[PDB]
Amino acid sequence: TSLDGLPETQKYVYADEWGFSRVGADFPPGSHPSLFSQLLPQALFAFDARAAVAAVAVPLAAMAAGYGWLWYMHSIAPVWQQALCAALIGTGYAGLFKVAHECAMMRFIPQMPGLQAALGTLLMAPALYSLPSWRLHHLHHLLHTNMLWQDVWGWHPLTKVELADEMVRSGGSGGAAMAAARLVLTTPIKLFASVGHWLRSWDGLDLRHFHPASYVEVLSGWAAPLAFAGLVLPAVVSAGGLSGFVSCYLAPWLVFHFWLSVLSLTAHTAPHIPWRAEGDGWDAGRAAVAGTVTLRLPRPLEVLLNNANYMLPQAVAPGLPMWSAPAAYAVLAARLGPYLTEASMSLKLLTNHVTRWQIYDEEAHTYRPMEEVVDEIEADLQQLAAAAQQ
């Protein structure tokens, strides 16, 4: 809660300035994000075979159609046809990956835990992701949602005092670190920053970060990815050459990583959402429901990605199945309507994420552009130097 209670007219003009479909109402402290799970009917937690098999076999068919189309004209295709096939395959794999992320939290087919764990491992493998490290990081996210200095497995924002500290530690903005930060948080490569998250899994490939009674499970978790990049990745190259690798593997990879990064970045970032450190005003239900955003999709994309944008219906109910995530949302707006936040697909939203909302300041408790912030903390350096000439 940052731009909390004031007339709804200015929050609506803010929502139109930012492309947001709504801005939340006031939320009082002392609540549990599991509370509002008592509202949903006792049939929203139901199990059925047809919906799940559709959710797994539809993006599969998308990917298969894209591959068949490509292998039909393997490398004689032009550039934008290649881009179309890459986007289609990456979207199908994002859907399959959401099925994976479902069976990782044990809420896909609880009837067969072994079969569902094997399915999650198999479907995470082609993206080079270990199932148990993913599960640990996602629970560690849920526990610290929107907490400062604590949720590093989400989109932890870069704050002001730390950037001034690095400014002094590098001796100006001309070092490698400052230039890297600028170039990564200013250009559309930010929309692919999830790649860096993939390099923060494999926690140094170090079992000293885990609980001993889990070692044999963590290593097997690092096995299915490695084995893949040890067996299949060669074969492809062997049978396709360098170009034949940049086509059938790397581009769908960048597509899936784009989808992942933008989903998360738009789900938990907004100027009307503050990032408090706990002790200095944090709360579970507040930073859960009030500091969140839900995005809108075309129903084709929603049946492809398998409800990949409904993150709150399963943050109030961690055991809510996947084919019921829209329906549950239907109930939630009926109850917490004024406090919800919503948004849609718009290149304007992404452009504001790229150019406007770049640095988080805790004084105004909101996001600011990076060049203005950098010139102004250079001005504060001028200030402290003026206090230092004598």
């Binding site: 835990p113 599960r135 609980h211 009674a213 889990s214 044999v216 499970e217």
Partner: protein, 42 residues
């Protein structure tokens, strides 16, 4: 000479222990992987 071991007590336990240990190798360091499989979400 001889130390008349059967009317002793430290000689009794040390003797039986050394004989038992020398009979056969009974060390098992490879049965502790069961200790690295106690938390599995499968």
């Amino acid at each position: 000479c001889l130390p008349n071991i059967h009317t002793s007590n430290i000689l009794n336990f040390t003797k039986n222990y050394e004989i038992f240990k020398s009979a056969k190798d009974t060390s098992n360091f490879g049965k502790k992987i069961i200790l690295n499989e106690m938390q599995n979400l499968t």
